[PDB]
């Protein structure tokens, strides 16, 4: 019966479910520690929520996120958005607003899609070409 | 639509009988690269590579003219000796610098 919040995270096709709840600072993703997400380069991208505002907010709660769908970079963007939205959900549900508003302002100042799902989605393709807009080669004579 | 001028049998045969290019080959001659680490290629490596501020496989093959394979064990030996300090480690590229007296 411990208070908790849940949210979603999507980039283009990946859904990440979050279970942000009070804890001692558990941070692992998919049951695996945050140090293992996949890129060894974009590793800092999922860290940015940890660093933009500070680890004190993460100290009093914990995040359990399960992501499914998409692939690789879409995956990591999905967990990034999911953890950001879960933290902000616990912020506006069980946390003082004076920190939540400043946190949201900093998040939006850094990048808009932290709390907003990306609007770019795949579109149907058309006949006469491999791609949606690129048509097949047509030669005269 | 004007009719197509059908070629005669002999004309078609002559046109198809004819049915031969070349290559510029502007690349320079192959660079003779050593495949065995000899004593003379050992002593120069031990002597002069502390001078370079930037050490890498490409630099080593370009200047000391040894095989790229032997280059890797050479850098490993230098790393074990501590004469160079690494900066970034990767399978496709290794970044080493001279061991300066500072830091």
């Amino acid at each position: 019966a411990v208070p908790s919040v849940q949210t979603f995270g999507k980039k283009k096709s990946a859904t990440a479910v979050a279970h942000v709840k009070a804890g001692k600072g558990l941070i692992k993703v998919n049951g695996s520690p945050i140090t293992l997400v996949e890129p060894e380069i974009l590793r800092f991208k999922v860290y940015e929520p940890l660093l933009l505002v500070g680890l004190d907010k993460f100290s009093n709660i914990d995040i359990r996120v399960r992501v499914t769908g998409g692939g690789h970079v879409s995956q990591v963007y999905a967990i990034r958005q999911a953890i950001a939205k879960g933290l902000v959900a616990y912020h506006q549900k069980y946390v003082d607003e004076q920190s939540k508003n400043e946190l949201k302002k900093a998040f939006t100042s850094y990048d808009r899609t932290l709390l907003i799902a990306d609007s770019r989605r795949p579109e149907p393709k058309k006949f006469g070409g491999k791609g949606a807009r690129s048509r097949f080669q047509k030669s005269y004579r | 639509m004007p009719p197509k001028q059908q070629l005669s049998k002999a004309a078609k045969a002559a046109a198809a009988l004819a049915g031969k290019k070349w290559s510029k080959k502007s690349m320079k001659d192959r660079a003779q690269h050593a495949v065995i680490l000899d004593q003379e290629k050992y002593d120069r490596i031990l002597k002069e590579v502390p001078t370079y501020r930037y050490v890498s496989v490409s630099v080593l093959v370009d200047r000391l003219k040894i095989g790229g394979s032997l280059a890797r064990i050479a850098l490993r030996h230098l790393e074990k000796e501590g004469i160079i300090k690494p900066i970034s480690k990767h399978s496709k590229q290794a970044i080493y610098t001279r061991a300066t007296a500072s830091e």
Binding site: - | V35, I36, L37, Y42, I73, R76, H77, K80, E81
Partner: protein
């Protein structure tokens, strides 16, 4: 620290199986220039005869050279699988053969002549010098003669 300097053990040119093979390359891939032997067979022979897979070709000693030589000469008595021969179930003899640099061309000419003599369709096509295996020559093949 694995740095070695021999005063001299490297042979510039070796004479395995009537071919002029140079050095400066790995011994595992040195047996690719011999006709009838490729990369996989070379690696298989190297790992079967424990010839230090990660080693160059020129500075190869004569004992292991002779070992490589006789394992070219015959693979059968050394429990090699029958899957690795180019003349499986030979027509003339019946024992699987692995005809080699001086033998692959002779055997190819031999069965080509057999097909020509039996007046086979494949033999007559090969004699004509043309596609023999279900190939559309309407648009394929222009720089031949």
């Amino acid at each position: 620290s694995l740095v070695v300097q021999e005063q001299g053990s490297f042979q510039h040119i070796l004479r395995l199986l009537n071919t002029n093979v140079d050095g400066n390359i790995k011994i595992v891939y040195a047996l690719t220039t011999i006709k009838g032997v490729g990369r996989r067979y070379s690696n298989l022979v190297c790992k079967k005869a424990d010839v230090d897979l990660h080693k160059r070709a020129g500075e190869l000693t004569q004992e292991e050279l002779e070992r490589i030589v006789q394992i070219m000469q015959n693979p059968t008595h050394y429990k090699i699988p029958a899957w690795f021969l180019n003349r499986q179930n030979d027509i003339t003899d019946g024992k699987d053969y692995h005809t080699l640099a001086n033998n692959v061309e002779s055997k190819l000419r031999d069965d080509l002549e057999r097909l020509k003599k039996i007046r086979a369709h494949r033999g007559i096509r090969h004699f004509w010098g043309l596609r023999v295996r279900g190939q559309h020559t309407k648009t394929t093949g222009r720089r031949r003669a």
